[PDB]
Amino acid sequence: EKSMPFIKHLASSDRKVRTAALNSLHAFLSARQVASALTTLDVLKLWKGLFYALWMCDRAIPQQNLCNELADLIWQLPRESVATWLRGFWATMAREWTGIDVLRMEKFLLLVRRVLGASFKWMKKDGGAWDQSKVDEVLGLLAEWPFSLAEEVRITGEIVQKIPVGMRLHVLDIWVDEVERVGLLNEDEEEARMIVQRISDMVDALEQTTKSPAVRTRSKDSLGDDRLPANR
């Protein structure tokens, strides 16, 4: 197993220990062969540490910077490791969702927003303006977690993680924001219209299959957005 001695310091009560530990994590991910070999268990340990780094961050502007810093970690990785990295994020947030106290809930809602936003941005071609293989990995994770027709996800001694309804509801009312932010609501480009339509298909399938009246009514809200082409 990899040695990651900085993880236990990400949650330290000393702010400078936390920053130094996070900087060590930055350095750890920059070693290209190490980042290329990241396992599911590796990223689960790293995202658990990052979760508690945000948990310990107490002020609004540091919280916003930290959410941007954590979302930007996606660019530090070789492309073959991004899917595993993001998978570790959603599995971590799914495990922790219901346990987050009220005072700390908002910054984690922001973290999900920034991580999802950076995921959409990472689909853009620097690897037709959209990379289909990257699109399919980001959209595949939407289908695997917030928009899944299943109740749980099997990871890897199987790890089975239930999908908390709060994760679905949060993604349902932010996903249009974040595709708009990266230019996917541009009607003149065919790839973008297809990507938006594909996500809408997933939400609509969730709406017609869920046993949850709340998921069903919030899926309708999500799909009724003024900004989507079908409503204009």
CA-based nearest residue to 117, from 154, 142, 147: 142
Coil, strand or helix at 210: coil
With b for 16 or more beta-carbon neighbours within 10 A and e for fewer, the 56-69 pattern comes to bbeeeeebeebbeb
Experimental method: X-ray
124, burial (CB in 10 Å: exposed 0-12, middle 13-18, buried 19+)? middle
d(CA 17, CA 14): 5
3-state SS, 61-84, equals HHHHHHHHHHHHHHHHCCHHHHHH
d(CA 182, CA 186): 10
d(CA 81, CA 83): 6
Please answer whether residues 199 and 142 qualify as being in contact, where contact means their C-beta atoms are separated by less than 8 angstroms: yes
Both tokens assigned to 169: 């509801």
Domain boundaries in the chain? 1-122, 126-232
Please answer whether residues 207 and 219 qualify as being in contact, where contact means their C-beta atoms are separated by less than 8 angstroms: yes
Q: Which residues touch 166 (CB under 8 Å, ≥6 apart)?
A: 97, 98
Write the CA distances from 13 to 59, 83, 141, 165, 198, integer angstroms: 14, 31, 33, 31, 44
> Which stretches of the chain are DSSP H helices?
15-30, 32-36, 40-56, 60-71, 82-96, 105-122, 132-144, 165-172, 175-181, 190-209, 213-223
Terminal-to-terminal C-alpha distance of the chain = 53
Write the CA distances from 181 to 120, 145, 196, integer angstroms: 9, 22, 13
At position 101, the amino acid (one-letter code) is D
183: left (phi over 0), alpha (psi -120 to 50) or beta: left
Residue bearing tokens 């920034």: 114
CA-based nearest residue to 67, from 86, 80, 85, 54: 54
CA-based nearest residue to 93, from 137, 131, 52: 52
DSSP one-letter code for 193: H
Half-sphere exposure of 229 (CA within 13 A, CB side): 17
What does R_g of the chain's alpha carbons equal in angstroms?
Answer: 18
Residue bearing tokens 């899917």: 83
Please answer whether residues 138 and 120 qualify as being in contact, where contact means their C-beta atoms are separated by less than 8 angstroms: yes
Beta pairing, strands 152-155 & 159-162? antiparallel
Q: Please count the other Cβ atoms lying within 10 Å of the Cβ belonging to residue 189.
A: 14
> Resolution in angstroms for this experimental structure?
2.2
At position 191, the amino acid (one-letter code) is E
Q: Please count the other Cβ atoms lying within 10 Å of the Cβ belonging to residue 181.
A: 13
